[PDB]
Each structure stands twice: as C-alpha cells, then as structure tokens.
Scaffold this active site. Structure first.
Site, short mmCIF file in Angstrom:
data_model
loop_
_atom_site.label_atom_id
_atom_site.label_comp_id
_atom_site.label_asym_id
_atom_site.label_seq_id
_atom_site.Cartn_x
_atom_site.Cartn_y
_atom_site.Cartn_z
CG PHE A 95 68.32 62.39 43.00
CD1 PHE A 95 68.16 61.16 43.60
CD2 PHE A 95 69.42 63.22 43.35
CE1 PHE A 95 69.05 60.73 44.51
CE2 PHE A 95 70.34 62.78 44.32
CZ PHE A 95 70.13 61.53 44.90
NE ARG A 119 60.12 66.24 47.00
CZ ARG A 119 61.10 66.52 47.86
NH1 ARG A 119 62.34 66.10 47.63
NH2 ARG A 119 60.83 67.23 48.93
CG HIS A 140 70.20 58.54 47.79
ND1 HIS A 140 68.91 58.13 47.51
CD2 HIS A 140 70.15 59.21 48.96
CE1 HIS A 140 68.13 58.52 48.49
NE2 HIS A 140 68.85 59.18 49.38
O1 LIG Z 1 65.43 61.29 50.96
C1 LIG Z 1 65.12 60.98 49.72
N1 LIG Z 1 64.28 59.94 49.33
S1 LIG Z 1 64.28 59.98 47.73
O2 LIG Z 1 64.85 58.76 47.28
O3 LIG Z 1 62.96 60.27 47.23
C2 LIG Z 1 65.22 61.24 47.43
C3 LIG Z 1 65.62 61.78 46.19
C4 LIG Z 1 66.48 62.91 46.22
C5 LIG Z 1 67.00 63.45 47.43
C6 LIG Z 1 66.64 62.91 48.68
C7 LIG Z 1 65.76 61.82 48.66
#
Ligand SMILES: O=C1NS(=O)(=O)c2ccccc21
Ligand SMILES: O=C1NS(=O)(=O)c2ccccc21
Ligand SMILES: O=C1NS(=O)(=O)c2ccccc21
Ligand SMILES: O=C1NS(=O)(=O)c2ccccc21
Ligand SMILES: O=C1NS(=O)(=O)c2ccccc21
Length: 165
Positions: free
Chosen positions: A113, A55, A126
C-alpha cells in the site's frame, strides 16, 4: 549501491492518468525492495503490470499488488513462498510511504500500500520499504476514486511499470 527507482503508469478505466515513481530502500530492506523491484519489471515472468489497486480509502492509503485474484485475497512473491518481515527499521511517517500488506507476522507476498497520511499504528506490523519520489499528485488523484469501505468507483490499473535509471 544506489537504491532502485521503479515507476507505475496508472490508468483510470483504461485512460492514462499519470506516472508515480518510487525509491525502494534496498539499503535497509534488500529482500523486500528486491521483491517489489522484480515484480515491477516483470523479469520473473509475472508481477504488477496490468493489475489494479483494489482497495482505496481516501485519507488513508491506496492498496494493490494482488495480481493473482485481483481482490485482496491473492498475490505472489518472487521467492516461491510468502516471506519474513525483514525488519521494522522504517516507520509510517506520512504520505508517500510504500509498505507491505500481509496476513500476519511473516506472510509477505506481493500486496502493498501507498500511504496518503501518517499511519503510525501500522509500525511494527507492516514493513516499510520505499517511498514515492515523484507523482504523489497522481496518488492523490487515484485516492479520489476510493471510498469508505475501500471499493473503487473506477478501475484503477497499473497500465505499465518497470525500473528507471
Ligand atoms: O490491516 C491490514 N491488513 S492489510 O495488509 O490488508 C492492510 C493494508 C493496509 C492497511 C492496513 C492493512
Ligand atoms: O539481501 C538479500 N536478502 S536474501 O537473503 O533474500 C538474499 C539472497 C541472495 C542475495 C542477497 C540477498
Ligand atoms: O540476487 C538475489 N537473489 S534473491 O532474489 O534471493 C535476492 C534478494 C535480495 C537481493 C538480491 C537478491
Ligand atoms: O506468470 C506466472 N508464472 S507462475 O506460474 O509462476 C505464476 C503464478 C501466479 C501468477 C502469474 C504467474
Ligand atoms: O508533494 C510531493 N511530491 S513528491 O512526488 O515528491 C512527494 C513524495 C512524497 C510525499 C509528498 C510528495
């Protein structure tokens, strides 16, 4: 002790693109940094080598770490189970921030990410645990193969990875 550094050698449809290296903040988030460090070396028998960034959203972030299902639905920590949010000391301050994807409070696996902008709304949700040290330009090159909905136009893979001295 000195924070670990890890590298990813990135390829685009199997052609080498360049190397991105990360400082991992073991001094602030030791459990989270150790997970990512070990997955990057493959020392537990599994981890990031050969996996892809599934992604990528230009201006936002490049997301990877799903070495089990290759699509955002999998991943595996080194701990036998998904793990806690260790703390939220570090914030999403800009490009280069390395942070954990998850499925809710305390459900860290192996997905992560790399931010390519400031993402302050993710603070407290996060866990930030590292930052690009070198090759941010390679993250920028990667970001271009992403799209609105996150799907990539070329296959972006971690051709090799490990720990630097
Ligand atoms: O909302 C989210 N669920 S996730 O952990 O896949 C993610 C990764 C990066 C930015 C946002 C988000
Ligand atoms: O820093 C640590 N967080 S932890 O509980 O997973 C742990 C276990 C063993 C040695 C060190 C550490
Ligand atoms: O030696 C270790 N075993 S552990 O993986 O639980 C761990 C977590 C964090 C830092 C060090 C260590
Ligand atoms: O290499 C591996 N040994 S394991 O069964 O724990 C495993 C689980 C998931 C992905 C890879 C691997
Ligand atoms: O321009 C950059 N070169 S770098 O790889 O050190 C880096 C890391 C983080 C943010 C930006 C930048």
């Amino acid at each position: 002790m000195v924070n670990p550094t890890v590298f990813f050698d990135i390829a685009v449809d199997g052609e080498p693109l360049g190397r991105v290296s990360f400082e991992l903040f073991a001094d602030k988030v030791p459990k989270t940094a150790e997970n990512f460090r070990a997955l990057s070396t493959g020392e537990k028998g599994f981890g990031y080598k050969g996996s892809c960034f599934h992604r990528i959203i230009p201006g936002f972030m490049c997301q990877g770490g799903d070495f089990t299902r290759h699509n955002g639905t999998g991943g595996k920590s080194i701990y036998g189970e998904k793990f806690e949010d260790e703390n939220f000391i570090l914030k999403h301050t800009g490009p280069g921030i390395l942070s954990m994807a998850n499925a809710g409070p305390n459900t860290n696996g192996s997905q992560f990410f790399i931010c390519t902008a400031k993402t302050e709304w993710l603070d407290g949700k996060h866990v930030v645990f590292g930052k690009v040290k070198e090759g941010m330009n390679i993250v920028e090159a990667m970001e271009r193969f992403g799209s609105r909905n996150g799907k990539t136009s070329k296959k972006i893979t971690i051709a090799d990875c490990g720990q630097l001295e």
